[PDB]
Amino acid sequence: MMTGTIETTGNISAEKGGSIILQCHLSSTTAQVTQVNWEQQDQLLAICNADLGWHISPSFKDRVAPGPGLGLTLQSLTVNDTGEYFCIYHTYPDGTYTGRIFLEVLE
Amino acid sequence: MTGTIETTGNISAEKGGSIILQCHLSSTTAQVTQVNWEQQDQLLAICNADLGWHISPSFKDRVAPGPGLGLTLQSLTVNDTGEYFCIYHTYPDGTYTGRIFLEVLES
Ligand SMILES: [Cl-]
């Protein structure tokens, strides 16, 4: 019933120390994007709210720049950064769409 | 981090009658972007701070918005039995979820 789909930047590799762009895109729906959250299973990274702008959560402020667009740029990568990241689009009237990216930080 | 959700709890109600599902978000000053009413599988309604109520079309006959941020179900059937979720999408806090289990009865 819900027609939106999400593309993402895929399952990726960067190396210890570097940077990476996390990005998604919502296709195939005319619904309004009211907010995008970036999260892990257990943690919030950042929110773009259509009305209010970007908020980066304090534990990531140091090493995360908003954008480009609705994406996120991770800096100073460590091994601990390995795992799943999620771009969560909150929309009206369709509701929540979620894309997934797996990151692996290399030895 | 700081918010908590009260709900109307776990409920029994009678085949054919009506019920109010309600949640309240406390202990956070964060702005509520919208509140989704969902089952595990499906969206029932969204109340969005800018756009107002959307009642999802397949539920329009049996779900009336309100009171406030809650939902009223009418003409319950045994299928209506299950989990309902009130999912607050907020800035800068993120998502808080309240749970309500509905068990619908004969006699
Ligand atoms: Cl807002």
From Swiss-Prot, chain A:
Expressed at low levels on peripheral memory and regulatory CD4+ T-cells and NK cells and is up-regulated following activation of these cells (at protein level). Glycans are attached at N11, N80. Residues 11-21 are annotated as: Homodimerization. Residues 1-103 form the Ig-like V-type domain. Disulfide bonds join C24-C87. Residues 1-107 are extracellular. It comes from the Eukaryota. It is found in: Cell membrane. Changing I21A: Abrogates interaction with PVR, cell clustering and PVR signaling. Inhibitory receptor that plays a role in the modulation of immune responses. Suppresses T-cell activation by promoting the generation of mature immunoregulatory dendritic cells. Upon binding to its ligands PVR/CD155 or NECTIN2/CD112, which are expressed on antigen-presenting cells, sends inhibitory signals to the T-cell or NK cell. Mechanistically, interaction with ligand leads to phosphorylation of the cytoplasmic tail by Src family tyrosine kinases such as FYN or LCK, allowing subsequent binding to adapter GRB2 and SHIP1/INPP5D. In turn, inhibits PI3K and MAPK signaling cascades. Contains 1 copy of a cytoplasmic motif that is referred to as the immunoreceptor tyrosine-based inhibitor motif (ITIM). This motif is involved in modulation of cellular responses. The phosphorylated ITIM motif can bind the SH2 domain of several SH2-containing phosphatases. Homodimer in cis; binds with high affinity to PVR, forming a heterotetrameric assembly of two TIGIT and two PVR molecules. Binds with lower affinity to NECTIN2 and NECTIN3. Interacts with GRB2. Interacts with NECTIN4. This is T-cell immunoreceptor with Ig and ITIM domains. It comes from Homo sapiens (Human). The lineage of its organism: Eukaryota, Metazoa, Chordata, Craniata, Vertebrata. The gene is TIGIT.
